[PDB]
From a paper:
LmrR belongs to the PadR-like family of transcriptional regulators (Pfam PF03551), which is named after a regulatory protein involved in the regulation of expression of phenolic acid decarboxylase (pad) genes. LmrR was shown to be a transcriptional repressor of lmrCD expression and an autoregulator of its own expression. LmrR forms a dimer with each monomer comprising a typical winged helix-turn-helix DNA binding domain and a C-terminal helix involved in dimerization. In between the two monomers is a large central pore that serves as the drug-binding site.
Riboflavin was identified as a ligand of LmrR by co-crystallization screening. The crystal structure of the riboflavin-bound LmrR complex (LmrR•RBF) was solved by molecular replacement and refined at 2.35 Å. Extra density in the central drug-binding pore confirmed the presence of bound ligand, but docking of riboflavin was complicated by the occurrence of alternative binding modes. Different potential binding modes of RBF fitting the electron density were tested by short 200 ps molecular dynamics runs, resulting in the identification of two stable unique binding modes with similar predicted binding energy. These two binding modes of RBF are related by a ~180° flip of the heterocyclic isoalloxazine moiety relative to the ribityl side chain. The occupancy of each of the four binding modes in the crystal was estimated to be 0.25. The flat aromatic isoalloxazine ring of riboflavin slides into the center of the flat-shaped hydrophobic pore of the LmrR dimer, in between the indole rings of the central Trp96/Trp96’ pair, while the ribityl substituent protrudes towards the pore opening. Riboflavin recognition by LmrR is likely dominated by the aromatic stacking interactions of the Trp96/Trp96’ indole pair with the heterocylic aromatic core of riboflavin. Near the pore opening, Asp100 may contribute to the stabilization of the hydrophilic ribityl moiety of riboflavin, by the formation of hydrogen bonds, although the observed disorder of the ribityl moiety indicates that these interactions are quite weak. The dissociation constant (Kd) for binding of RBF to LmrR was determined as 0.26 ± 0.08 μM, using a fluorescence-based titration assay.
Author numbering:
A (entry chain A), B (entry chain A): 5 to 69, 76 to 108
Write the structure that this text describes.
């Protein structure tokens, strides 16, 4: 299911960035560690996703003193809205089971 | 965010069907109750989503002795796979926070 994995990777990448500004290799390390090894992102997958997020204003980038990525203001608020509504969804689903 | 609401509604509808075969009005009642009133689905929204799920083999339909909908075999397994991987995602996200 290609576009569910895509969605999953998006959420994860945004959450890494939420923890702090980071660069591609740093992100890939953090995701591999937090996933107990089960998830090893390809450098190129990150460039594809980051090209799209930048265009949509959700993230921005800049150079160290190596390319760093940053969650924008829009990006933070979009994450908050997403977490809020998906949490409603999770409780609705909880009420359907019992 | 049109296509996130769409995704949310999909998950909810599939979970209703997971609880048991149901018909459009019954589903809408159950979702409104489980959502403490915050979520009132339109009859037409359900037809749009159910047309797509049927085509993809995820659900099927039949008449009572009124149209009933049913999660297919594929449908159940797809739900299980989705719940499993999103649960990995949730734990990965948990490790990134602390
Ligand atoms: C920020 C966030 C975004 C999510 N996005 C999706 C999604 O696009 N599709 C999906 O099926 N589940 C998503 N989920 C998980 C969802 O709440 C649910 O656990 C699974 O969809 C299966 O129940 C998301 C969860 C979080 C916390």
């Amino acid at each position: 299911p290609k576009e569910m994995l895509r969605a999953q990777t998006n959420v994860i990448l945004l959450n890494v960035l939420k923890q702090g500004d980071n660069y591609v290799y740093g992100i890939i390390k953090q995701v591999k560690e937090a996933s107990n090894g089960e998830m090893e992102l390809n450098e190129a997958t990150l460039y594809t996703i980051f090209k799209r997020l930048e265009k949509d204003g959700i993230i921005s980038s800049y150079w160290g003193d190596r390319k760093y990525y940053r969650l924008t203001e829009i990006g933070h608020e979009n994450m908050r809205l997403a977490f809020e509504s998906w949490s409603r969804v999770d409780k609705i689903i909880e009420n359907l089971e019992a």
